[PDB]
Design a binder for these strands. Structure first.
Ligand SMILES: CO[C@H]1CCO[C@@]2(C)Oc3c(C)c(O)c4c(O)c(c5c(c4c3C2=O)NC2(CCN(CC(C)C)CC2)N5)NC(=O)[C@H](C)CCC[C@H](C)[C@H](O)[C@@H](C)[C@@H](O)[C@@H](C)[C@H](OC(=O)c2ccccc2)[C@@H]1C
Ligand SMILES: [Zn+2]
Lengths: 49, 96, 195, 174, 1126
DNA sequence: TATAATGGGAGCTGTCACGGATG
DNA sequence: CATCCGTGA
């Protein structure tokens, strides 16, 4: 929902997500950049990290 | 303050969840004072609720030193930690 | 479509009573700040005029309820309270927006997130950075493909704490405070150090 | 009665008491009265004498009446005044770092000084404490009495001259 | 010659003889407008000269609409008349200096009429201090020169639109009635052949419902509109009948939620459309409706309101146009052309000038105090009522004050050059209140309309997102009393041109037929060919016999604007680059001293004069005395006027407004003659640049992709050097810990730093200042907070007691430097009137002498821009045979692409002008130079010439003149008939293999200099909320690494780079500090933490009743440097 | 805070292309 | 498959 809300229709994304009690596994590019984690690609993956 | 936490959950906040967040209820529309320029009590900036304006500086002036940490002044009820809390402490309004 | 709504409240023990509020939260003061400018005038956030709107009307209800006011007056206050909490949560959503001075729409809570200016696309997907600068560009047929001409003025502020480090290394300055002063005064020593 | 009262009570984003509002409205009244009399907007000195006879307060009153503006108001893709307001609170990087290096210089002072000597230093100045205890308590809370702790004070003040003669503390004052 | 009127330098012109009329006053758009507002003598004479019957001023009008002010009783009556001004409270120069508004106080005569007591009390009332407009056509609000731009709005009136239906594919016609202010009214036609009306965007109802509501019988409906089957189908499908049943029906759909009385439905139908209170068509609103319907066409403008006659005659206009009728006569009205109206046509598009814009704001204020008047009338007693007790001018003075500094109609005075002002004083913006927003404007509003010819320029308009919404007024145009744009045309009686000129409006011209300016004319006045080039309505053009010619253009250059006509060989450059060629001239910079261009267009004179940034002699006489300070003129009658020189003043944009006396002592000077010009002016001509010796060739790549190479001669001779002045300010206030005091004593500062101050703490005039240095030493009492125990210890060792005063000095901003050229100090002590709280205010002025360097943006008049790539030493420069090095090396590649080869022609004519020439007269006058006027058959070295747009030099004469090029001092010609010449590479010595095109070009210094543009930052200030860096060079902020840039990183797969940028480089409170320390200690960069901005989001969500919790791998809610507690 | 007084007042103008609920 | 409101550009 982090990736979705940070795209478009932010008021609609949150309304639905807060009702469905959607939990976000912070495992993606848009997801990680926001929280400040290393992005799960390139030199960020544990294989190389 | 480790960075790696697995999940982030969002849900609908209970009317009780609002109370469990807030360090007090705002009962006055006022923001600050017109002469003292200080956050008025039970107002939208009340230091009893959200925290001290200056680091370890209680409101009524009874405590002004870093020596008191976590002390709740009796004369106005202000905890003594940094103004770094006015960015994290919540309030609430009780609708009739 | 109705099921998609009702099925979501059944699964998680997430009560649908939440869609009606008995107590609204108030965002921390330093996120709705009030600042004095150099002109003496104060500059405040819009949430403080909407929080003030709600509290002013909510309290008036307490007075009118207590005084045993007729329903015609009490209900009116209730209705304004609805439009108040609404105007705070999402202004302009229902009806005409709340105008401040100069017929300007007040920034509601939800407005802090929406679109380009919203907290998302403008403060999370791309921020502003330290250790950075900008200037005009000029052709340089002398440089090799792995090189670029960086102005002596730009670089000194770019590597400022890296230069302060080596200034106190080679004893040009006695500490970190004075080494700072050297770079700001642009003493002739630093042009050898920065190189 | 209730309207005017409530209006003066609620309309101000920063609350001014009832009498204060009464003042400003009298100042706007006498101004408009002196406005048609002098074919010009009256000087601060002129307005003052008529109503309150004090020039200093009139300037002050006219600032109280000044209504605040909005941070979220804009000028431009996105103006937003609040995007120019500098956070006077946040900590300067270099200034915080230089303070820490001053702690590395006072650590090299707790050493040359004795254990008795580096004792009173952290006692009345309050380094680890955070509080400056009264000297007649310090000498009595320290196992050594007869206020020997003020006696060891002078046994240190000149011992501090050597790291002051090394000038390693001379640089951090200028 | 071209303009042989003032006493100017002789600029010879290739031209067909232009004697229609001189360029009318350029500044007249602002002047004539504001003169109408105050009803000045020059205007009432101008009203007389134009033959205007009974002229009413802008202020006079507002009073007559308002008057008389009566209550509901009709007992009391307040009215106003006879407005008058006093002298201005303070001269212009003092206003700019003491930051007050240039204004003259306004008075009116008010009388309180009472019908019961029959007595009248009449006296004079003060109305406030009224902002007056200068001679240069600007205003002065709070010490800064401002300018009111003219707005392009939709003119009120009735408009008809033909929309094509998607499904039925039939033609549907829609009408829309627009008041100046009031409710909406629009009649449209369905595909169902039923007529409907939408009132204020309410749902559609049959049109017969409205007629039966008016009181028109069901039989009269059959009469007036019976000639159509679509109206018979409407009255038939009509739901209900009855005068009562119609009013109720309309009431029910207009305002639901209210009890429908037969007396309440009758009432509002009167007020919403037929009362001056709720509804109002302006004088233009009435006049425009009348022209379209053709009723009361001769009768003077007395009605400001809509009528029933107009309603019916509008419905009649709709139905006929629907079934194919082309013409119609309204009963009681003259015949009118029936057709769909275009909204963008300048007869339906209105230009509201300065006067009306101020007038509208004034009308707003008079309505506010009228509301207070009607409240102060019912309160007070009848016998003690005077206009002084009724009138509260507070909302009036506020309304005018708000506008000049609260609205977007008061654009800042662009102070770039004598042309910058000029261009900016006359602008056509469709933006602003009453107009349109930027997102609302489609693609039709922006593009060039046919009616724009001779009225508004099609070239001059911004490049950016404002393109097409902003334009400049054409040179010869003017504004008529109704707010439309008129333009001059020569009158042809019968194939014979007459010097008699009449100004035409947009729609009026459409009814006529106009010939092109350059059409060949007999020496008497007749045409050459029967069929000539002809302009016609709707932008259509055809050949038409000479018997049908009504009018012809004044000038070839009639359609262009002021800055546009200053582009030599305009008709050789494509509109894309020619656009930029006009826009960039605006951003030229005033150099140390300025030269007039070798190639001109003639416009350079009148532009300089009408700029107001030169000194023009008022009355004829002789220079009695001249100094660098002032010029004194001894008139013929004996009186003496002295003109003071603006010397080294800072403009609005930090450029150098500096004036110098042209005339010597004892010169005979006539009226209107330039006796002293300003920045960017050489002998009373717009000098926007320098004449440079150009070379069209690639050179070692240093001019690759529009870059520019310069000769160091331009640095050693200051040819492109400029002066830039900055104003630095700082104040001392009253605080809670005491008061800020300006002193020479600043805590912990050596006497080496203070060395350039005086005893007060102010820098001394003439001193040198670099960045970081101190200008005004100020210290403030810092809060008595417990000083550090580690700094307490440090103050006992060296025994130095701490002062309670913190350094709050005014230091020089990063990048700035120069010589301190003046101090302005305002003290509350010395009775200088300051804002509440301020004691001493200091203004230090620092100028810089910026020579031209790498990265500075240069440009020509042909959209040929670019930055300085490299400035070689003078010897490295490609030089001609006689040793002379070229100044500027432009790249060949970037010329044919831009289609702006007028820069090439400028180079050819530019060389002929530098060398001089002489046509061969032996064996007669050659055939190519046969159209060349006599005065150009022989020219001196360094001669000045004119190439008027759509006239001037042609390619045949230019080629021939290249053969006429006079040899240098050594008796050798340097360029050929091709225009080329042979160069020697200053580096290798060997001659370049091929001939290179050499000549002179006019290059301007634009205001995009690296000294301003460059900026960097390690650490600095931070956002108060998001805790991110601040933004801008002014706040010393870092760059923005946007969403687009984070994709580039992500694509590369540089996680650690991307993480660092958004963490320890940004808003990690504890990180950026520990990064600074790790660097200065030489350790490794630590691991980033949590972005404080993300903490903000999780708190902003919480405030919205969204329980947001962070979970570790187990599932427990972990803290975020904080805790929850009830 | 005791004459009597009783239902508001500015609209806002020139988008555009699309999905989803309703026809 | 085509309209009305809200949301972006
Ligand atoms: C109050 O005035 C301001 C507007 C208000 O807002 C809007 C919504 O209404 C506007 C209206 C009604 C206009 O007609 C506009 C207009 O005509 C512009 C520009 C805009 C607007 C504009 C708005 O944006 N806007 C941008 C500005 C920058 N963003 C650009 C970004 C990418 C960097 C893009 C568009 N250009 N110019 C051009 O198109 C032509 C090509 C050339 C420019 C001529 C000259 C440079 C100019 O005359 C200045 C001397 C000065 O007049 C300007 C600077 C004013 O600033 C102070 O005067 C001023 C005075 C004191 C303090 C501060 C400023 C602005 C205008
Ligand atoms: Zn206390």
């Amino acid at each position: 929902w982090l990736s979705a809300a940070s795209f478009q229709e932010t008021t609609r994304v949150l309304t639905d997500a807060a009702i469905n009690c959607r939990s976000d596994k912070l495992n993606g590019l848009k997801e990680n950049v926001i929280i400040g984690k290393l992005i799960p690609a390139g030199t960020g993956i544990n294989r190389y990290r | 303050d480790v960075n790696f936490f697995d999940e982030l959950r969002i849900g609908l906040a209970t009317a009780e969840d609002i109370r469990q967040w807030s360090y007090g209820e705002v009962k006055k529309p006022e923001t600050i004072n017109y002469r003292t320029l200080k956050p008025e009590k039970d107002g939208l900036f009340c230091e009893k609720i959200f925290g001290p304006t200056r680091d370890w500086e209680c409101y009524c002036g009874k405590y002004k030193r870093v020596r008191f940490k976590g002390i709740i002044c009796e004369r106005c009820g202000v905890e003594v930690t940094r103004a770094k809390v006015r960015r994290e402490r919540m309030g609430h309004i009780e609708l009739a | 479509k109705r099921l998609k709504v009702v099925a979501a409240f059944q699964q998680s023990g997430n009560s649908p009573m939440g869609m009606v509020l008995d107590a609204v939260p108030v965002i921390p003061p330093e996120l709705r700040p009030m600042v004095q400018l150099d002109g003496g005038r104060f500059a405040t956030s819009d949430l403080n005029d909407l929080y003030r709107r709600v509290i002013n009307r909510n309290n008036r209800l307490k007075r009118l309820i207590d005084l045993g006011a007729p329903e015609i007056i009490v209900n009116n206050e209730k209705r304004m309270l609805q439009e108040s909490v609404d105007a705070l949560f999402d202004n302009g959503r229902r009806g005409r927006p709340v105008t401040g001075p100069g017929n300007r729409p007040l920034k509601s809570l939800s407005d802090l997130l929406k679109g380009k200016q919203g907290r998302f696309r403008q403060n999370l997907l791309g921020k502003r950075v330290d250790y950075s600068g900008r200037s005009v560009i000029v052709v340089g047929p002398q440089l090799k493909l792995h090189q670029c001409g960086l102005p002596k003025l730009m670089a000194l502020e770019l590597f400022k704490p890296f230069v302060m480090k080596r200034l106190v290394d080679l004893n040009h300055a006695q500490n970190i405070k004075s080494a700072k002063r050297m770079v700001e005064r642009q003493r002739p020593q630093v042009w050898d150090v920065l190189e | 009665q209730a309207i005017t009262r409530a209006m003066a009570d609620q309309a101000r984003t920063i609350r001014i008491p009832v009498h204060m509002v009464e003042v400003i409205n009298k100042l706007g009244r006498i101004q408009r009265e002196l406005l048609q009399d002098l074919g010009r907007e009256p000087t601060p000195e002129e307005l003052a004498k008529e109503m309150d006879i004090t020039p200093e307060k009139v300037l002050e009153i006219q600032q109280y009446a000044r209504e605040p503006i909005s941070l979220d108001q804009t000028i431009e893709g996105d103006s937003q005044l609040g995007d120019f307001i500098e956070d006077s609170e946040a900590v300067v990087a270099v200034d915080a770092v230089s303070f820490t290096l001053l702690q590395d210089q006072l650590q090299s002072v707790l050493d040359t000084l004795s254990e008795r000597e580096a004792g009173v230093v952290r006692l009345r100045f309050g380094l680890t404490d955070g509080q400056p205890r009264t000297l007649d308590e310090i000498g009595q809370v320290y196992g050594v009495t007869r206020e020997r702790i003020r006696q060891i004070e002078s046994k240190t003040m000149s011992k501090l001259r050597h790291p002051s003669r090394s000038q390693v503390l001379r640089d951090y004052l200028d | 010659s071209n303009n042989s009127v003032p006493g100017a330098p002789n600029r010879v012109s290739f031209a067909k003889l232009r004697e229609p009329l001189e360029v009318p006053g350029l500044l007249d758009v602002q002047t004539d407008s504001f003169e109408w507002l105050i009803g000045s003598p020059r205007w009432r004479e101008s009203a007389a000269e134009r033959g205007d019957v009974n002229p009413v001023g802008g202020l006079e009008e507002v009073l007559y609409e308002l008057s008389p002010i009566e209550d509901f009783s009709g007992s009391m009556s307040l009215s106003f008349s006879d407005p008058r001004f006093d002298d201005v409270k303070a001269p212009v120069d003092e206003c700019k200096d003491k930051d007050m508004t240039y204004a003259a106080p306004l008075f009116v005569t008010a009388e309180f009429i009472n019908n019961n007591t029959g007595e009248i009390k009449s006296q004079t009332v003060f109305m406030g201090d009224f902002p007056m407009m200068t001679e240069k056509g600007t205003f002065i609000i709070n010490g800064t020169e401002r300018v009111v731009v003219s707005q392009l709005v939709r003119s009120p009136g009735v408009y008809f639109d033909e929309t094509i239906d998607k499904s039925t594919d039939k033609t549907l016609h829609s009408v829309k009635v627009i008041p100046s202010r009031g409710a909406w009214l629009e009649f449209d036609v369905d595909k169902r052949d039923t007529v409907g009306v939408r009132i204020d965007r309410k749902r559609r109802q049959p049109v017969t419902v409205l007629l039966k509501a008016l009181g028109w019988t069901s039989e009269q409906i059959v009469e007036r509109f019976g000639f159509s089957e679509i109206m018979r189908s409407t009255l038939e499908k009509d739901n209900t009948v009855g005068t009562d049943e119609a009013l109720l029906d309309i009431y029910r759909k207009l305002r639901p939620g209210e009890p429908p009385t037969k007396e309440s439905a009758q009432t509002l139908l009167e007020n919403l459309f037929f009362k001056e209170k709720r509804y109002d068509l302006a004088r233009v609103g009435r006049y425009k409706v009348n022209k379209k319907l053709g009723l009361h066409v001769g009768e003077p403008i007395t009605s400001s309101t809509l009528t029933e006659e107009d309603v019916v005659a509008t419905i009649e206009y709709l139905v006929r146009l629907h079934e194919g009728q082309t013409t119609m006569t309204v009963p009681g009205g003259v015949e009118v052309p029936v057709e769909t109206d275009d909204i963008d046509h300048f007869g339906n598009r209105r230009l509201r000038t300065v006067g009306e814009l101020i007038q509208n704001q004034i009308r707003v204020g008079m309505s506010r105090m009228e509301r207070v008047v009607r409240e102060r009338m019912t309160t007070q007693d009848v016998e003690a009522i005077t206009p002084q007790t009724l009138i509260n001018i507070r909302p009036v003075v506020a309304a005018i004050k708000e506008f000049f500094g609260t609205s977007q109609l008061s654009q800042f005075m662009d102070q770039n050059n004598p042309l910058s002002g000029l261009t900016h004083k006359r602008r056509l913006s469709a933006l602003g209140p009453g107009g349109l927003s930027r997102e609302r404007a489609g693609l039709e509003v922006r593009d060039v309309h046919p009616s724009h010819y001779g009225r508004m320029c099609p070239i001059e308009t911004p490049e950016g997102p404002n393109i097409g919404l902003i334009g400049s007024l054409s040179v010869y145009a003017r504004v008529n009393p109704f707010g439309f744009i008129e333009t001059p045309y020569r009158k042809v009686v019968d194939g014979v041109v007459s010097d008699e000129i009449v100004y035409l409006t947009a729609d009026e011209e459409d009814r006529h037929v106009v010939a092109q300016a350059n059409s060949p004319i007999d020496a008497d006045g007749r045409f050459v060919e029967p069929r000539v080039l002809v302009r016609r309505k709707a932008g259509e053009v055809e050949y038409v016999p000479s018997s049908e010619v009504d009018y012809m253009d004044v000038s070839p250059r009639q359609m262009v604007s002021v800055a546009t006509a200053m582009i030599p060989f305009l008709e050789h450059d494509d509109a894309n680059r020619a656009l930029m060629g006009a826009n960039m001239q605006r951003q030229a910079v005033p150099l140390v001293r300025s030269e007039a261009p070798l190639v001109g267009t003639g416009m350079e004179l009148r532009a300089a004069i009408d700029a107001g940034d030169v000194v023009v002699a008022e009355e004829s006489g002789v220079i009695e005395e001249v100094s660098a300070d002032y010029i004194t003129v001894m008139h013929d009658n004996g009186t003496r006027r002295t003109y003071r020189m603006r010397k080294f003043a800072r403009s609005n944009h930090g450029t150098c407004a500096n004036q110098c006396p042209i005339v010597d002592a004892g010169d005979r000077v006539e009226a209107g003659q330039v006796i002293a010009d300003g920045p960017c002016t050489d002998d009373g001509e717009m000098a926007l640049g320098k004449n440079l010796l150009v070379a069209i060739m690639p050179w070692e790549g240093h001019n690759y992709e529009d870059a520019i190479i310069l000769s160091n001669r331009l640095v050693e001779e200051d040819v492109l050097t400029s002066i830039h002045i900055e104003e630095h300010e700082i104040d001392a206030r009253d605080t809670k810990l005491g008061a800020e005091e300006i002193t020479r004593d600043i805590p912990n500062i050596s006497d080496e730093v203070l060395a350039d101050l005086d005893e007060r703490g102010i820098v001394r005039i003439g001193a040198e200042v670099r960045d970081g240095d101190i200008l005004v030493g100020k210290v403030t009492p810092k809060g008595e907070t417990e000083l550090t125990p580690e700094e307490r210890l440090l103050r006992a060792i060296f025994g130095e007691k701490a002062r309670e005063v913190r350094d709050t000095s005014l230091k020089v901003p990063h990048g700035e430097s120069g010589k301190v050229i003046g101090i302005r100090v305002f003290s509350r002590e010395d009775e200088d009137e300051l804002p509440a709280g301020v004691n001493e205010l200091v203004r230090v002025y620092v100028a810089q002498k910026r020579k031209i360097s790498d990265g500075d943006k240069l440009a020509g008049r042909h959209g040929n821009k670019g930055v300085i790539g490299k400035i070689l030493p003078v010897e490295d420069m490609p030089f001609l045979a006689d040793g002379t090095p070229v100044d500027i090396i432009l790249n060949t590649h970037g010329v044919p692409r831009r289609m702006n080869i007028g820069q090439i022609l400028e180079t050819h004519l530019g060389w002929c002008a530098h060398s001089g020439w002489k046509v061969d007269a032996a064996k007669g006058v050659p055939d190519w130079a046969a159209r060349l006027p006599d005065e150009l058959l022989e020219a001196q070295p360094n001669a000045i010439v004119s190439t008027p747009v759509f006239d001037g030099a042609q390619e045949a004469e230019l080629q021939g003149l290249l053969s006429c090029t006079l040899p240098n001092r050594d008796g050798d010609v340097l360029v050929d008939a091709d225009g080329k010449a042979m160069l020697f590479d200053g580096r290798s010595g060997e001659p370049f293999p091929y001939p290179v095109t050499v000549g002179y070009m006019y290059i301007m210094k634009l205001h995009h200099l690296v000294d301003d543009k460059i900026h960097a930052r390690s650490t600095g200030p931070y956002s108060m909320i998001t805790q991110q860096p601040l933004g801008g060079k002014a706040q010393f902020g870092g760059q923005r690494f946007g969403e687009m840039e984070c994709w580039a990183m992500q694509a590369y797969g540089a996680a650690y780079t991307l993480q660092e940028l958004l963490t320890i480089k940004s808003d990690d409170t504890v990180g950026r500090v520990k990064v600074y320390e790790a660097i200065v200690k030489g350790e490794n960069i630590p691991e980033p933490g949590i972005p404080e901005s993300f903490k903000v989001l999780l708190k902003e969500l919480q405030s919205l009743c969204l329980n947001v919790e962070v979970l570790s791998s187990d599932g427990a809610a972990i803290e975020l440097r904080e805790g929850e507690d009830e």
